[PDB]
Design a protein around this nucleic acid. Structure first.
Length: 772
RNA sequence: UACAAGAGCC
RNA sequence: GGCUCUUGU
């Protein structure tokens, strides 16, 4: 039924200079054997995943000769149990009773092992060979979890990651926090091998040491003898918050050991048993995190403990590939899996960054220095005659101050005359309001008093719903376009920092700031073209931005509100109806090429977002004007993945980060062959960072060649408003993120009546922006 | 919310 | 979705 699939890729890329890169991939030889599948029905399910792993280890170490023998399984810690060899258990569902011995009451786990399937590895063989259209994910998770279970004992796995132990090292941080610098282990398909994907993770952990030192260090009370007088109930309530939910165990029973469960306060387990453990006998076994409670400065320095440069990331993943030694891993090499520790050789395509045209008096050309360029006193295309405008500071009055607002305004108009704006005069009204209570009479006063008001400036303290109320009022009620600055960019200013604000408020009303070179433009630009971008984000968010003209700066935005915990677009018809009628109003020309975008989508949701975000635009385009179906170039970006690219022996080291140069498209040998995709990194040296941006283009209507698509997408990265810094993701996707957050705030002041009473967006703002 | 880049947070 | 820091033009 789901025949509305992404098309196969028509042609590989050949443009630009070809580079031989070293990706974040590790070559490995995968055999043709079939991995079997078994299910674990665990009773009870109140125990966590680590307790399940310990009990499965107990029944291999206790019932070796009956279920397994020398053939041994591999384990996914919640339900799944895979094995490369044929286990001697078969169809027989043994409801094995795990008997951990105890003080009278033994810990009884009722687990049943049942054969489910024999997973054919020839399916993934046909997948990476290119003769299958789509790569299966169940078999890629089986190949992932082949290499989990032996490192599951040494590194306690949560999510799809690993949490390393202190291999001869130590780390204190304070407040009961330590960093467990493991790694995000993954495997991704390719052409030749299903090469491994290792990225460092480096998260926090709540250690594996008993609760005496915990009450020594977390409550900062190392001795209770000095605290002779007891405190109030607050330490008891904090004890109830923190101590409950952390598993302890006994060690006062000789060789007989077991693991206990904590649900009451320390009143371990039920109150009807005879095993109660005070603070002097509790021992916490590893595997406990995510129930953390501390201030965020430890989180920030823990983020610093992960923040590593790209050559440092090369050395760290190379050290991890040496020290963990997955070829020396016993059950992995018993499973027929061996890896190649050496970094791969991948063939890529570095791109010439396109020369842009800015208009104005000179109309000369500026070229990017590997994805980055500055205007540097070069006038843009269409400046806008700003005559009357207003300031409505909705921060408290001490923050937005008068002489600093005057110097911000003056340096804004002076750098905007340097960049080519005819800003006429000071703003007429500079009012200093308080908050979300009284937003409406002064907005009515600004609408009725100053006729033809062009822009209103709003100053905000931070994340607060006076912003939410002013955005809802300004884009639904009466209709002035609201641009918002915080004082953190007003108090400290640099010419870049306010030049980019003047070019945000340039396009806020509407105008053209940049145009690509007609010689440098792809042949899509010889026809009219609509650049579209979607975003899914307390009801939830539907928000889509489309452009206005062939000159790629003028856009406009739509907002709707949808039900929560849903990441689909369902009201797309009204959105792109408004976008294409505003295109028709803007240029008197129906655009011929649709360039769709969406930022931040899950990898498994692609067929459903294809189903609801291209059939909806098709039933909208039959509703706008008859015999009008422009070709859609649907590009779905990812921006969060564990797949990196590293420079070839530092041949072209750029920046202090040491990452790869900008535009380095890689489609062969590490990207998925069988579908329509490419990697792209349009970045520079920032913070110490290794990254691409996976532009998995999900639909091309007329099936243009991907050589044109990648250079058009690189240009569209260099058609942002803030194109002064490399924006890495083409412009309507990031506009869509802004307008998505806008729809989010549009409904916070409060079935769907509260939603339906504040969605009637005004006609005086849908021609303008409310997001940049 | 000048904008960007991304480690997780919890 | 959620923030919280670091480095930047």
């Amino acid at each position: 039924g789901y025949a509305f699939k992404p098309p196969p890729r028509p042609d590989f890329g050949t443009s630009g200079r070809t580079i031989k890169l070293q990706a974040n991939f590790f070559e490995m030889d995968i055999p043709k054997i079939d991995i079997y599948h078994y299910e674990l029905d665990i009773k009870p399910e109140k125990c966590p995943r680590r307790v399940n792993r310990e009990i499965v280890e107990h029944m291999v170490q206790h019932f070796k000769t009956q279920i397994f023998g020398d053939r041994k399984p591999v384990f996914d810690g919640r339900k799944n149990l895979y094995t490369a060899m044929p286990l001697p258990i078969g169809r027989d569902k043994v409801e094995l009773e795990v008997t951990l011995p105890g003080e009278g009451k033994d810990r009884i786990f009722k687990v049943s092992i049942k054969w489910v399937s024999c997973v054919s590895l020839q399916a993934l063989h046909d997948a990476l060979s290119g003769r299958l259209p789509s790569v299966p994910f169940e078999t890629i998770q089986a190949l992932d979890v082949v290499m989990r279970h032996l490192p599951s004992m040494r590194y306690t796995p949560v999510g799809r990651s690993f949490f390393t132990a202190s291999e001869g090292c130590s780390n204190p941080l304070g407040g009961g926090r330590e960093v467990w610098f493991g790694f995000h282990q993954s495997v991704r398909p390719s052409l030749w091998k299903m090469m491994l994907n290792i990225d460092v993770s480096a998260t926090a952990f709540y250690k594996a040491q008993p609760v005496i030192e915990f009450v020594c260090e977390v409550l900062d009370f190392k001795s209770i003898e000095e605290q002779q007088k007891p405190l109030t109930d607050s330490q008891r309530v904090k004890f109830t918050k923190e101590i409950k939910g952390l598993k302890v165990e006994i060690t006062h029973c000789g060789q007989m050991k077991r693991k206990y469960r904590v649900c009451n306060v320390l009143q371990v387990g039920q109150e009807q048993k005879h095993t109660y453990l005070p603070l002097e006998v509790c021992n916490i076994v590893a595997g406990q995190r995510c129930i953390k409670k501390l201030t965020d400065n430890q989180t920030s320095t823990m983020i610093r403990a992960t923040a590593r440069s790209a050559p440092d990331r090369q050395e760290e993943i190379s050290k991890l590939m040496r020290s963990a030694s997955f070829n020396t891993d016993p059950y992995v090499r018993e499973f027929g899996i061996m890896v190649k520790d050496e970094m791969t050789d991948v063939t890529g395509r570095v791109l010439q960054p396109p020369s842009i045209l800015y208009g104005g008096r000179n109309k000369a050309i500026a070229t990017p220095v590997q994805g980055v360029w500055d205007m540097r006193n070069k006038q843009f295309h269409t400046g806008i005659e700003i005559k009357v405008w207003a300031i409505a500071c909705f921060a408290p009055q001490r923050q937005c101050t008068e002489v600093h607002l005057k110097s911000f305004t003056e340096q804004l108009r002076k750098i905007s005359r340097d960049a080519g704006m005819p800003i006429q005069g000071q703003p007429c009204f500079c009012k200093y309001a308080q908050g979300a209570d009284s937003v409406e009479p002064m907005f009515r006063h600004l609408k009725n008093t100053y006729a033809g008001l062009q822009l209103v400036v709003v100053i905000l303290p931070g994340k607060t719903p006076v912003y939410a109320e002013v955005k809802r009022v300004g884009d639904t009620v009466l209709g002035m376009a609201t641009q918002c600055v915080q004082m953190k960019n007003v108090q400290r200013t640099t010419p870049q920092t306010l030049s980019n604000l003047c070019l945000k408020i340039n396009v806020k009303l509407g105008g053209v700031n940049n145009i690509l070179l007609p010689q440098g433009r792809p042949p899509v630009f010889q026809q009219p073209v609509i650049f579209l971008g979607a975003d899914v984000t307390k009801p939830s968010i539907a928000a889509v931005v489309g452009s206005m003209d062939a000159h790629p700066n003028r856009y406009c935005a739509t907002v709707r509100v949808q039900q929560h915990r849903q990441e689909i677009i369902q009201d797309l018809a009204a959105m792109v109806r408004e976008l294409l009628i505003q295109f028709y109003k803007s240029t008197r020309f129906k655009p011929t090429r649709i360039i769709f975008y969406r930022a931040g989508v899950s990898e498994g949701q692609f067929q459903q977002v294809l189903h609801h975000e291209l059939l909806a635009i098709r039933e909208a385009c039959i509703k706008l004007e008859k015999d009008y179906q422009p070709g859609i170039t649907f590009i779905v970006v990812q921006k969060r993945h564990h797949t990196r690219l590293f420079c070839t022996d530092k041949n072209e080291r750029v920046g202090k980060s040491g990452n790869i140069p900008a535009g380095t498209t890689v489609d062969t040998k590490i990207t998925h062959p069988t579908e329509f995709d490419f990697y792209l990194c349009s970045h520079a040296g920032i913070q110490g960072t290794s990254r691409p941006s996976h532009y998995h283009v999900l639909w091309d209507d007329n099936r243009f060649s991907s050589d044109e698509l990648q250079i058009l997408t690189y240009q569209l990265c260099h058609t942002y408003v803030r194109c002064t810094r490399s924006v890495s993701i083409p412009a309507p996707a990031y506009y869509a993120h802004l307008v998505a957050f806008r729809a989010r705030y549009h409904l916070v002041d409060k079935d769907h009546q509260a939603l339906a009473k504040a969605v009637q967006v005004h006609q005086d703002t849908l021609r303008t922006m409310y997001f940049a």
